[PDB]
């Protein structure tokens, strides 16, 4: 009985921590697990394509994926692994700095049995935050960085 | 402070019941409320475009939208109303009978402060259900109907 | 394979609505369902003791209980029913007007596979509300009434003098 | 503006991890934070304390207070309530139930006091379905016996009564 669980949210909301919490619950009950992280985030098997780790993922019962927005094959990999009987758990940004869908990540939602959106704390007014605000001028989607480059931000502070 | 809350799930998961629970909480505390439903699901204003009813939503503090997937202008309405300081609560199918995004509904996710995906009971094996299965052979996306035309199903029963 | 689910929260948080949402999910999939309500609240079987109703409950697959705080035998009934393979869903206040456990209701928590606490809207400042504030001066726990006798309130409004 | 959040669940449900996830969201937004642990639980797997009163002074100088294994502090209710009323956010990870599936100390008295309450889930160590309970493996009868998976299984209803 395979499965896809999706953990959405803005930056700084602890998506990776929730991912690991959920993975460790299985691990402690004797499940073989594998966590996959996006190689190019220079801030678990590193990968740039989920194809490149599919063989390793096949000999495991539970698959965790961090920063799933950055894998071009995220959708098809997850659906294929769940149909093969695996429990697939994905941590991912739902939105870019422009509050648009981050790549193909939202295509997982109609395929998933569980979907949640976490909240961060707004770094500018300290209320609840749902969005990621880019601090710089760069216009491309993929720009790797932490709190030096992005603020987790509420609606009002986003447009401030 | 305006916001968008999204209630996703398959058919028969009680999305519009959760919509009404959330709205009545504000109503009981003396908030002015408006609920919108899709005018063509026959089976509290009906509408085909949210544009047709937006001026009315302006005179209100809390807006509920049922079957949001059927509204082509769902994204711009919810985003504009939330930025005008309204609480917008949307019940909607995340996926079609083919487990694909239903209209533009998922473009709401990166704009939303709250997103949940509800769960139904699988009408075939009686485990937890995440999807909607069309029973007949019609090909088009919009086919109105209940349990005579659709089953809420788990992954395994979907692929039978 | 039985179960207890507990829906907690203050007044006006829609606990009964969420109870019915969960029950109708099973009903629509052709489960036999029964809902039990507290009889001394006249603001779908009425009852004062769950014992009085246990045989009707034994004949269904899913049992809903509204205002579970008022039932002296809430703990033993839910446990007996869940062990007999029933799905038991309980709507109940967690706290009295004094923010104290309401009867034996919290004893369900260690017995339950699912527990949630819902939120209301504060009727005094309109932020999120977790508590039920009594408007009058009656001192007894059980006083039946709606928004004329109680406000859902946040922490600050609860303590406002 | 003060708050009490409660994270319940059986053992192995990752309550401490969820506690740290919530606290770190505040810390990363430059809030002053304090995490308190039960001193007598020395397991491999944060100020140690046996009474929350003993760390009250440190807690007063902080905006966010995390409390791990809240069930073991006798003064859990009055500490959490006083700190929330003083405008602190207090987040508590705790067992709701003992090995007997009874209330664990005073922990449930927090529930009517709390604006947020959740019960987490574990995996059943005996049938691998969802687990809501903690089953003691040995014969000890006293409530407090410190241990991990060597002494307890997270367990579903059916496996509890086997
Ligand atoms: C918002 C945004 C982030 N990013 C990048 C910046 C970071 O390197 C990376 C962060 O992605 P996250 O998915 O937020 O990293 P994470 O898994 O550690 O999340 P969490 O802290 O909640 O546990 O994404 C973009 O490239 N483009 C964007 O538009
Ligand atoms: C899955 C699917 C449903 N539908 C239709 C069939 C129904 O008339 C309608 C159901 O939409 P819902 O949004 O599920 O109706 P609802 O608001 O009453 O939700 P709930 O019962 O959980 O409270 O959508 C399609 O037209 N195409 C599809 O692919
Ligand atoms: C707080 C409190 C309420 N009550 C009573 C007043 C009401 O008659 C009754 C309401 O209990 P509820 O459990 O809130 O009734 P409900 O099922 O309608 O809940 P909801 O609206 O969320 O769906 O409880 C007391 O008797 N004593 C108290 O201390
Ligand atoms: C059930 C039970 C546990 N204990 C003890 C055993 C542990 O030392 C402690 C439980 O602490 P926990 O933090 O609840 O144990 P855990 O690490 O498995 O939890 P989590 O994964 O959610 O973070 O309490 C008792 O003393 N008596 C009991 O009846
Ligand atoms: Mg722990
Ligand atoms: Zn802000
Ligand atoms: Zn099924
Ligand atoms: Zn208030
Ligand atoms: Zn089991």
XYZ file of C-alpha atoms and ligand atoms in Angstrom:
764
model
C 0.000 0.000 0.000
C 2.001 2.915 -1.410
C 1.392 6.546 -0.669
C 2.384 10.163 -1.320
C 2.430 12.708 1.515
C 3.220 16.328 0.709
C 4.509 18.901 3.201
C 4.139 22.368 1.665
C 4.961 25.780 3.172
C 7.082 28.913 2.822
C 10.771 29.069 3.738
C 11.704 28.778 7.448
C 8.564 26.770 8.347
C 10.471 23.561 9.205
C 9.410 21.402 6.237
C 12.657 19.332 6.430
C 12.163 18.822 10.180
C 8.590 17.603 9.640
C 9.921 15.366 6.855
C 12.478 13.819 9.230
C 9.904 13.488 12.031
C 7.671 11.474 9.670
C 10.570 9.372 8.292
C 11.958 8.560 11.780
C 8.523 7.264 12.894
C 8.850 4.496 10.285
C 12.607 4.015 10.831
C 12.177 3.358 14.571
C 9.565 0.692 13.650
C 12.190 -1.159 11.520
C 11.279 0.257 8.081
C 14.157 0.697 5.635
C 14.280 4.384 4.713
C 16.050 6.687 2.265
C 16.172 10.491 2.344
C 17.007 12.355 -0.885
C 18.221 15.967 -0.809
C 18.779 18.395 -3.713
C 22.515 18.435 -4.504
C 22.749 22.064 -5.687
C 21.450 23.538 -2.423
C 24.830 24.263 -0.842
C 23.579 25.787 2.439
C 20.671 11.753 2.820
C 21.682 11.033 -0.804
C 22.395 14.192 -2.836
C 20.696 14.257 -6.252
C 19.753 16.600 -9.110
C 17.431 14.115 -10.811
C 15.352 11.514 -8.994
C 16.111 9.102 -11.881
C 19.732 9.071 -10.675
C 18.706 7.463 -7.339
C 15.686 5.353 -8.426
C 17.621 2.073 -8.019
C 18.600 2.943 -4.433
C 14.989 4.031 -3.816
C 13.649 0.650 -5.016
C 15.350 -1.319 -2.194
C 13.623 0.752 0.505
C 10.082 0.953 1.971
C 9.913 4.689 2.825
C 11.286 7.500 0.640
C 11.767 11.049 1.952
C 12.448 13.932 -0.471
C 13.645 17.382 0.636
C 13.271 20.493 -1.578
C 11.201 18.537 -4.120
C 10.398 21.686 -6.118
C 13.901 21.477 -7.653
C 13.525 18.052 -9.273
C 12.210 18.152 -12.881
C 10.977 14.562 -12.424
C 9.402 15.010 -8.940
C 5.809 14.233 -10.047
C 6.424 11.081 -12.117
C 9.012 9.654 -9.711
C 6.678 10.035 -6.695
C 3.651 8.559 -8.481
C 5.736 5.626 -9.800
C 7.267 4.880 -6.394
C 3.877 4.991 -4.624
C 2.375 2.661 -7.266
C 5.300 0.298 -6.556
C 4.176 0.161 -2.888
C 6.493 2.800 -1.381
C 5.587 5.498 1.158
C 6.810 8.732 -0.425
C 7.081 11.848 1.746
C 7.880 15.167 0.082
C 8.969 18.447 1.652
C 8.679 21.307 -0.843
C 8.101 25.023 -1.332
C 4.606 25.538 -2.757
C 5.446 29.025 -4.038
C 8.342 30.959 -5.544
C 9.380 34.482 -4.436
C 6.591 35.721 -6.773
C 3.980 33.521 -5.037
C 3.581 31.447 -8.216
C 3.669 27.621 -8.282
C 7.247 26.403 -7.814
C 7.852 24.323 -10.953
C 5.660 21.224 -11.254
C 5.350 20.621 -7.489
C 1.598 21.303 -7.185
C 0.852 18.496 -9.684
C 1.552 16.145 -6.744
C -1.544 17.386 -4.839
C -4.229 15.522 -6.914
C -2.024 12.409 -6.717
C -1.394 12.606 -2.958
C -3.286 11.011 -0.079
C -2.028 13.639 2.415
C -1.329 17.359 1.860
C -0.478 20.011 4.451
C 0.753 23.614 4.334
C 2.975 24.696 7.238
C 3.432 28.233 8.552
C 6.546 30.218 9.389
C 6.929 33.322 11.579
C 6.971 36.626 9.681
C 10.462 38.105 9.995
C 9.211 41.674 9.543
C 6.112 41.912 11.797
C 6.316 38.555 13.640
C 2.771 37.364 12.880
C 2.201 34.049 11.025
C 3.924 33.786 7.617
C 2.774 31.926 4.482
C 5.122 33.354 1.820
C 8.824 33.755 0.914
C 10.112 37.261 0.089
C 13.329 37.656 -1.922
C 15.510 40.425 -0.459
C 17.607 41.021 -3.598
C 17.149 42.168 -7.207
C 17.756 38.894 -9.111
C 14.862 37.722 -11.325
C 15.561 34.023 -11.975
C 13.599 31.494 -9.891
C 16.482 29.342 -8.606
C 18.630 31.429 -6.248
C 20.108 29.371 -3.373
C 20.250 31.103 0.022
C 18.875 31.408 3.553
C 17.770 34.313 5.762
C 20.474 36.482 4.145
C 18.539 36.290 0.843
C 14.895 35.595 1.885
C 12.389 36.543 4.594
C 9.418 34.403 5.591
C 6.644 36.920 5.395
C 2.890 37.494 5.924
C 0.573 38.923 3.223
C 0.854 42.584 4.330
C 4.654 42.524 4.718
C 4.987 40.804 1.321
C 3.439 43.815 -0.423
C 5.093 46.349 1.935
C -5.948 41.526 7.682
C -7.335 39.523 4.779
C -6.522 35.901 4.028
C -7.229 32.877 1.816
C -8.079 29.439 3.258
C -8.372 26.448 0.932
C -10.264 23.236 1.741
C -9.272 20.525 -0.722
C -10.236 16.863 -0.983
C -11.997 14.290 -3.153
C -15.752 13.972 -3.525
C -17.721 12.876 -0.414
C -15.113 14.245 2.039
C -17.473 16.992 3.305
C -15.567 20.046 2.011
C -18.671 22.266 1.866
C -19.630 21.147 5.404
C -16.196 22.286 6.624
C -16.704 25.503 4.595
C -19.975 26.152 6.436
C -18.458 25.343 9.865
C -15.698 27.919 9.304
C -18.113 30.591 8.004
C -20.729 30.152 10.799
C -17.989 30.770 13.418
C -17.555 34.297 12.011
C -21.322 34.779 11.495
C -22.101 33.852 15.118
C -19.579 36.547 16.201
C -21.538 39.179 14.184
C -19.386 39.159 11.016
C -21.181 39.861 7.735
C -20.857 36.760 5.519
C -21.520 35.729 1.910
C -21.501 32.182 0.527
C -21.154 31.563 -3.217
C -21.970 28.273 -4.973
C -21.539 27.133 -8.598
C -24.834 27.854 -10.390
C -24.725 24.739 -12.602
C -24.332 22.122 -9.869
C -28.027 21.741 -9.082
C -28.278 18.515 -6.998
C -26.113 31.976 -0.559
C -25.696 33.203 -4.154
C -25.331 30.922 -7.190
C -22.879 32.073 -9.910
C -20.846 30.994 -12.972
C -18.250 33.751 -12.702
C -17.152 35.274 -9.412
C -17.008 38.580 -11.319
C -20.828 38.476 -11.414
C -21.001 38.629 -7.636
C -17.824 40.526 -6.615
C -19.530 43.850 -5.772
C -21.738 41.968 -3.276
C -18.640 40.312 -1.748
C -17.188 43.804 -1.198
C -19.937 44.666 1.334
C -19.017 41.616 3.427
C -16.127 40.626 5.758
C -16.078 36.837 5.248
C -16.490 35.137 1.838
C -17.189 31.415 1.323
C -16.838 29.793 -2.102
C -18.180 26.295 -2.721
C -16.971 24.152 -5.657
C -14.263 26.704 -6.461
C -12.780 24.472 -9.176
C -15.610 25.437 -11.560
C -14.870 29.185 -11.422
C -12.424 30.284 -14.172
C -11.661 33.498 -12.230
C -11.094 31.809 -8.816
C -7.472 33.009 -8.484
C -7.911 36.742 -9.227
C -11.115 37.060 -7.154
C -9.687 35.398 -4.007
C -6.398 37.278 -4.250
C -8.107 40.666 -4.791
C -10.659 40.111 -2.004
C -7.971 39.001 0.474
C -5.825 42.029 -0.394
C -8.932 44.170 0.263
C -8.983 42.715 3.801
C -11.559 39.913 3.478
C -11.384 36.375 4.856
C -11.873 34.106 1.842
C -12.659 30.422 2.427
C -12.732 28.033 -0.545
C -14.046 24.458 -0.720
C -12.837 22.690 -3.866
C -11.873 19.435 -5.540
C -8.098 19.344 -6.001
C -8.321 16.754 -8.770
C -10.548 15.620 -11.629
C -11.669 12.007 -12.197
C -8.206 11.629 -13.796
C -6.284 12.888 -10.734
C -5.204 16.019 -12.640
C -5.483 19.622 -11.328
C -9.122 20.733 -11.543
C -9.166 23.997 -13.509
C -7.024 26.703 -11.921
C -7.748 25.802 -8.271
C -4.149 24.861 -7.347
C -2.833 28.306 -8.334
C -4.514 29.350 -5.052
C -2.065 27.284 -2.950
C 0.973 29.682 -3.168
C -1.416 32.594 -2.536
C -3.040 30.983 0.496
C -2.247 31.188 4.203
C -4.238 28.006 4.942
C -4.456 24.797 2.877
C -5.817 21.401 3.994
C -6.721 18.259 2.035
C -9.660 16.367 3.471
C -10.308 12.687 3.282
C -13.288 10.521 2.301
C -14.132 6.839 2.864
C -13.328 4.539 -0.099
C -16.682 3.279 -1.343
C -15.089 0.041 -2.620
C -12.678 -1.202 0.097
C -13.707 1.199 2.903
C -10.215 2.439 3.711
C -9.278 6.129 3.491
C -10.033 7.766 0.108
C -8.079 10.581 -1.568
C -9.496 10.499 -5.124
C -12.672 10.628 -7.210
C -13.475 7.787 -9.618
C -15.902 8.265 -12.506
C -18.134 5.213 -12.892
C -19.325 5.870 -16.465
C -17.468 6.404 -19.744
C -17.903 10.142 -20.418
C -14.731 11.935 -21.419
C -15.308 15.605 -20.583
C -14.212 17.089 -17.244
C -17.515 18.731 -16.210
C -20.064 15.985 -15.473
C -22.367 16.946 -12.584
C -23.552 14.174 -10.233
C -23.136 12.302 -6.945
C -22.593 8.676 -5.895
C -24.552 7.454 -8.929
C -21.758 8.866 -11.131
C -18.660 8.817 -8.880
C -16.936 6.868 -6.087
C -14.480 8.285 -3.583
C -11.561 5.805 -3.711
C -8.102 4.965 -2.387
C -5.092 4.514 -4.708
C -5.495 0.729 -5.121
C -9.221 0.885 -5.916
C -8.673 3.769 -8.352
C -6.339 1.595 -10.457
C -8.699 -1.397 -10.608
C -11.289 -2.733 14.250
C -12.581 0.019 16.578
C -11.598 3.593 17.353
C -12.236 6.705 19.473
C -11.963 10.144 17.900
C -12.380 13.225 20.087
C -13.403 16.690 18.855
C -12.718 19.235 21.599
C -13.096 23.007 21.685
C -14.897 25.945 23.279
C -18.524 26.834 22.644
C -19.362 28.131 19.143
C -16.443 26.331 17.399
C -18.746 24.018 15.399
C -17.902 20.744 17.187
C -21.363 19.291 16.251
C -20.880 20.302 12.622
C -17.475 18.541 12.473
C -19.013 15.496 14.197
C -21.712 15.316 11.518
C -19.137 15.827 8.735
C -17.166 12.810 9.980
C -20.297 10.647 10.505
C -21.753 11.432 7.044
C -18.463 10.353 5.418
C -19.127 6.803 6.710
C -22.890 6.900 6.122
C -22.426 7.816 2.445
C -20.224 4.700 2.089
C -23.155 2.588 3.469
C -22.045 2.223 7.112
C -24.789 1.940 9.728
C -24.607 5.065 11.884
C -26.120 6.323 15.130
C -25.880 9.781 16.675
C -26.521 10.344 20.391
C -27.354 13.756 21.834
C -27.606 15.003 25.434
C -31.315 15.031 26.369
C -31.324 17.950 28.840
C -30.213 20.357 26.086
C -33.220 21.392 23.967
C -31.692 24.433 22.249
C -30.525 11.150 16.512
C -31.198 9.662 19.971
C -31.554 11.865 23.060
C -30.046 10.367 26.241
C -28.964 11.210 29.811
C -26.825 8.092 30.246
C -24.999 6.290 27.441
C -25.822 2.991 29.188
C -29.498 3.606 28.261
C -28.551 3.473 24.599
C -25.747 0.867 24.404
C -27.841 -1.831 22.665
C -28.876 0.492 19.854
C -25.172 1.452 19.566
C -24.118 -2.219 19.382
C -26.281 -2.597 16.239
C -24.395 0.057 14.218
C -20.819 0.437 12.920
C -20.260 4.162 13.637
C -21.384 6.002 16.797
C -21.498 9.793 17.130
C -21.879 11.536 20.500
C -22.738 15.251 20.840
C -22.005 17.158 24.087
C -20.069 14.215 25.558
C -19.046 16.252 28.615
C -22.544 15.883 30.088
C -22.461 12.060 30.075
C -21.213 10.561 33.378
C -20.347 7.305 31.609
C -18.606 8.816 28.550
C -15.275 7.080 29.250
C -16.546 3.540 29.873
C -19.070 3.642 26.990
C -16.593 4.833 24.330
C -13.974 2.346 25.473
C -16.489 -0.557 25.462
C -17.754 0.435 21.993
C -14.301 0.900 20.421
C -13.186 -2.485 21.795
C -16.307 -4.082 20.258
C -15.059 -2.774 16.881
C -17.117 0.428 16.535
C -15.854 3.809 15.287
C -16.698 6.297 18.059
C -16.642 10.042 17.381
C -17.213 12.422 20.279
C -17.982 16.136 20.180
C -17.417 17.798 23.565
C -16.366 20.905 25.460
C -12.926 20.391 26.997
C -13.402 23.109 29.607
C -16.122 24.612 31.760
C -16.632 28.363 32.202
C -13.799 28.140 34.785
C -11.399 26.640 32.212
C -11.414 23.409 34.233
C -11.835 19.880 32.829
C -15.504 19.403 31.955
C -16.574 16.251 33.811
C -14.708 13.071 32.873
C -14.219 14.088 29.217
C -10.420 14.427 29.220
C -10.075 10.832 30.468
C -10.975 9.898 26.855
C -7.735 11.468 25.607
C -5.289 8.670 26.664
C -7.860 6.207 25.258
C -8.298 7.976 21.887
C -6.461 7.444 18.600
C -7.451 10.903 17.367
C -7.767 14.139 19.380
C -8.314 17.666 18.074
C -9.117 21.020 19.673
C -11.123 23.390 17.478
C -11.086 27.190 17.558
C -13.947 29.697 17.786
C -13.983 33.425 17.005
C -13.640 35.745 20.039
C -16.967 37.546 20.452
C -15.271 40.460 22.206
C -12.104 41.193 20.190
C -12.693 38.947 17.124
C -9.352 37.129 17.293
C -9.245 33.312 17.675
C -11.073 31.937 20.754
C -10.197 28.871 22.874
C -12.441 29.398 25.903
C -16.073 29.732 26.984
C -16.910 32.745 29.179
C -20.097 32.777 31.277
C -21.946 36.105 31.102
C -24.100 35.684 34.245
C -23.257 34.976 37.889
C -24.595 31.429 38.372
C -21.921 29.275 40.015
C -23.032 25.752 39.070
C -21.222 23.957 36.223
C -24.294 22.912 34.194
C -26.205 25.940 32.858
C -27.784 25.320 29.437
C -27.779 28.270 27.000
C -26.425 29.838 23.802
C -24.778 33.183 22.966
C -27.148 34.960 25.365
C -25.486 33.172 28.316
C -21.928 32.599 26.968
C -19.243 34.192 24.778
C -16.412 32.341 23.031
C -13.274 34.275 24.039
C -9.511 34.510 23.643
C -7.194 34.506 26.701
C -7.124 38.313 27.128
C -10.889 38.699 26.831
C -11.415 35.804 29.254
C -9.550 37.784 31.942
C -10.904 41.276 31.084
C -12.275 43.109 34.132
C 0.111 38.222 23.795
C 0.607 34.852 25.517
C -0.203 31.298 24.487
C -0.146 27.607 25.466
C 0.344 24.974 22.753
C 0.199 21.283 23.649
C 1.756 18.438 21.639
C 0.378 15.086 22.814
C 0.921 11.545 21.519
C 2.297 8.135 22.486
C 6.035 7.451 22.650
C 7.915 7.440 19.300
C 5.455 9.887 17.676
C 8.167 12.559 17.423
C 6.684 15.053 19.924
C 10.156 16.460 20.821
C 10.968 16.980 17.138
C 7.670 18.850 16.606
C 8.462 20.884 19.738
C 11.829 21.911 18.277
C 10.267 22.635 14.845
C 7.841 25.124 16.436
C 10.429 26.803 18.694
C 13.007 27.174 15.875
C 10.468 29.073 13.740
C 10.477 31.709 16.499
C 14.255 31.578 17.095
C 15.007 32.120 13.376
C 12.788 35.229 13.568
C 15.087 36.500 16.371
C 12.806 35.725 19.344
C 14.556 34.848 22.605
C 13.900 31.151 23.295
C 14.333 28.641 26.126
C 13.897 24.877 26.002
C 13.428 22.930 29.224
C 14.020 19.193 29.604
C 13.230 16.727 32.384
C 16.563 16.131 34.162
C 15.860 12.530 35.230
C 15.472 11.352 31.611
C 19.141 10.988 30.707
C 18.613 8.903 27.555
C 20.751 9.450 24.484
C 18.090 10.669 21.966
C 18.046 22.953 26.770
C 18.069 23.563 30.543
C 17.526 20.407 32.627
C 14.989 20.658 35.483
C 12.922 18.560 37.901
C 10.562 21.448 38.694
C 9.640 24.261 36.306
C 9.736 26.659 39.290
C 13.537 26.065 39.420
C 13.907 27.702 35.981
C 11.138 30.338 36.372
C 13.713 33.143 36.556
C 15.365 32.219 33.249
C 11.930 31.734 31.609
C 10.854 35.265 32.598
C 13.619 36.781 30.430
C 12.450 34.945 27.318
C 9.642 35.274 24.734
C 9.194 31.569 23.796
C 9.352 28.591 26.202
C 9.616 24.974 25.041
C 8.959 22.162 27.541
C 9.862 18.551 26.698
C 8.255 15.641 28.614
C 5.800 17.970 30.385
C 4.048 15.033 32.066
C 6.949 14.708 34.553
C 6.816 18.244 36.017
C 4.396 18.431 39.001
C 4.022 22.206 38.506
C 3.295 22.040 34.724
C -0.157 23.683 34.932
C 0.747 26.687 37.103
C 4.030 27.382 35.271
C 2.455 27.232 31.789
C -0.563 29.296 32.849
C 1.527 31.996 34.624
C 3.987 32.286 31.711
C 1.210 32.468 29.094
C -0.580 35.099 31.200
C 2.717 37.040 31.376
C 2.635 37.095 27.564
C 4.977 34.217 26.701
C 4.349 31.563 24.055
C 4.604 28.210 25.867
C 4.897 25.015 23.791
C 4.653 21.620 25.512
C 5.581 18.127 24.310
C 4.039 15.433 26.506
C 2.602 11.961 26.817
C -1.175 12.137 27.318
C -1.200 8.639 28.786
C 0.826 6.227 30.895
C 1.495 2.558 30.008
C -1.946 1.908 31.548
C -3.575 4.392 29.127
C -4.423 6.629 32.107
C -3.813 10.401 32.335
C -0.096 11.053 32.893
C 0.251 13.183 36.024
C -1.359 16.614 35.624
C -0.786 16.975 31.854
C -4.445 16.935 30.730
C -5.283 19.878 33.018
C -3.438 21.976 30.412
C -6.040 21.158 27.742
C -8.839 23.547 28.932
C -6.077 26.157 29.412
C -4.555 25.764 25.930
C -5.318 27.565 22.685
C -3.764 24.732 20.653
C -3.981 20.959 21.322
C -2.935 18.108 19.021
C -2.380 14.356 19.417
C 0.368 12.935 17.213
C 0.554 9.421 15.842
C 3.275 6.747 15.881
C 3.764 3.498 13.906
C 2.610 0.287 15.656
C 5.763 -1.664 16.466
C 3.815 -4.944 16.422
C 1.506 -4.709 13.356
C 2.850 -1.530 11.702
C -0.519 0.251 11.487
C -1.016 3.604 13.292
C -0.157 3.704 17.015
C -1.866 5.827 19.706
C -0.574 4.151 22.893
C 2.588 3.223 24.775
C 2.881 -0.408 25.865
C 5.266 -1.353 28.681
C 7.309 -4.460 27.817
C 8.360 -5.590 31.320
C 6.599 -6.184 34.647
C 7.317 -2.938 36.545
C 4.237 -1.345 38.120
C 5.370 2.175 39.068
C 4.309 4.910 36.615
C 7.771 6.461 36.124
C 10.223 4.070 34.451
C 12.634 5.875 32.106
C 13.255 3.966 28.858
C 13.140 3.886 25.065
C 12.161 1.147 22.593
C 13.967 -1.363 24.835
C 11.222 -0.840 27.473
C 8.156 0.316 25.476
C 6.390 -0.247 22.146
C 4.202 2.313 20.412
C 1.064 0.335 19.746
C -2.439 0.369 18.208
C -5.573 -0.626 20.166
C -5.579 -4.307 19.129
C -1.875 -4.792 19.861
C -2.227 -3.050 23.242
C -4.646 -5.717 24.495
C -2.693 -8.751 23.198
C 11.262 31.194 -2.412
C 12.426 30.645 -3.190
C 13.389 29.871 -2.543
N 14.425 29.383 -3.243
C 15.457 28.547 -2.603
C 16.260 29.232 -1.504
C 16.764 28.052 -0.692
O 18.026 27.587 -1.173
C 15.765 26.944 -0.933
C 14.974 26.731 0.344
O 13.971 25.778 0.055
P 13.209 25.022 1.245
O 12.349 23.951 0.602
O 12.401 26.035 2.007
O 14.390 24.376 2.127
P 14.131 23.462 3.430
O 13.773 22.052 3.036
O 15.342 23.481 4.334
O 12.842 24.148 4.115
P 12.650 24.351 5.698
O 13.581 25.442 6.167
O 11.232 24.794 5.939
O 12.972 23.062 6.416
O 14.923 27.354 -2.018
C 14.543 29.653 -4.637
O 15.509 29.194 -5.286
N 13.638 30.393 -5.290
C 12.581 30.912 -4.651
O 11.754 31.603 -5.284
C -14.232 14.462 -9.799
C -15.162 15.309 -10.633
C -16.320 15.846 -10.077
N -17.136 16.601 -10.840
C -18.366 17.189 -10.301
C -19.397 16.157 -9.852
C -20.195 16.910 -8.807
O -21.337 17.520 -9.403
C -19.271 18.008 -8.318
C -18.832 17.683 -6.905
O -17.940 18.699 -6.491
P -17.594 18.895 -4.932
O -16.690 20.110 -4.838
O -16.955 17.655 -4.372
O -19.039 19.131 -4.280
P -19.272 19.597 -2.759
O -19.015 21.077 -2.650
O -20.690 19.261 -2.357
O -18.177 18.786 -1.877
P -18.515 17.870 -0.583
O -19.505 16.793 -0.933
O -17.250 17.197 -0.116
O -19.085 18.766 0.480
O -18.131 18.052 -9.186
C -16.829 16.851 -12.207
O -17.606 17.552 -12.900
N -15.712 16.349 -12.771
C -14.862 15.588 -12.067
O -13.834 15.124 -12.614
C -18.845 26.337 29.123
C -20.119 25.686 29.619
C -21.141 25.367 28.728
N -22.273 24.795 29.181
C -23.360 24.430 28.267
C -24.059 25.591 27.572
C -24.675 24.918 26.358
O -25.994 24.466 26.660
C -23.820 23.691 26.098
C -23.052 23.848 24.793
O -22.136 22.768 24.693
P -21.430 22.380 23.305
O -20.611 21.124 23.525
O -20.575 23.537 22.869
O -22.675 22.119 22.311
P -22.576 21.912 20.715
O -22.627 20.443 20.400
O -23.693 22.649 20.016
O -21.145 22.537 20.277
P -20.897 23.384 18.921
O -21.713 24.646 18.912
O -19.435 23.736 18.841
O -21.291 22.558 17.733
O -22.928 23.561 27.214
C -22.426 24.501 30.571
O -23.475 23.958 30.992
N -21.455 24.789 31.457
C -20.312 25.369 31.064
O -19.423 25.624 31.907
C 4.334 5.404 28.760
C 5.348 5.757 29.819
C 6.562 6.341 29.474
N 7.445 6.640 30.448
C 8.737 7.276 30.183
C 9.638 6.584 29.175
C 10.416 7.754 28.602
O 11.593 7.994 29.376
C 9.498 8.952 28.739
C 8.778 9.232 27.432
O 9.284 10.407 26.811
P 8.888 10.689 25.274
O 9.558 11.956 24.795
O 7.397 10.733 25.144
O 9.438 9.363 24.517
P 9.832 9.319 22.951
O 11.254 9.774 22.747
O 9.622 7.927 22.408
O 8.782 10.390 22.356
P 8.897 11.199 20.972
O 9.422 10.290 19.880
O 7.484 11.604 20.642
O 9.759 12.425 21.077
O 8.523 8.607 29.716
C 7.148 6.382 31.806
O 7.986 6.673 32.689
N 5.991 5.821 32.167
C 5.073 5.489 31.259
O 4.003 4.973 31.646
Mg 10.797 12.535 23.426
Zn 4.352 40.382 8.589
Zn -10.195 1.298 -1.707
Zn -10.647 38.417 22.486
Zn -0.760 -2.977 16.099
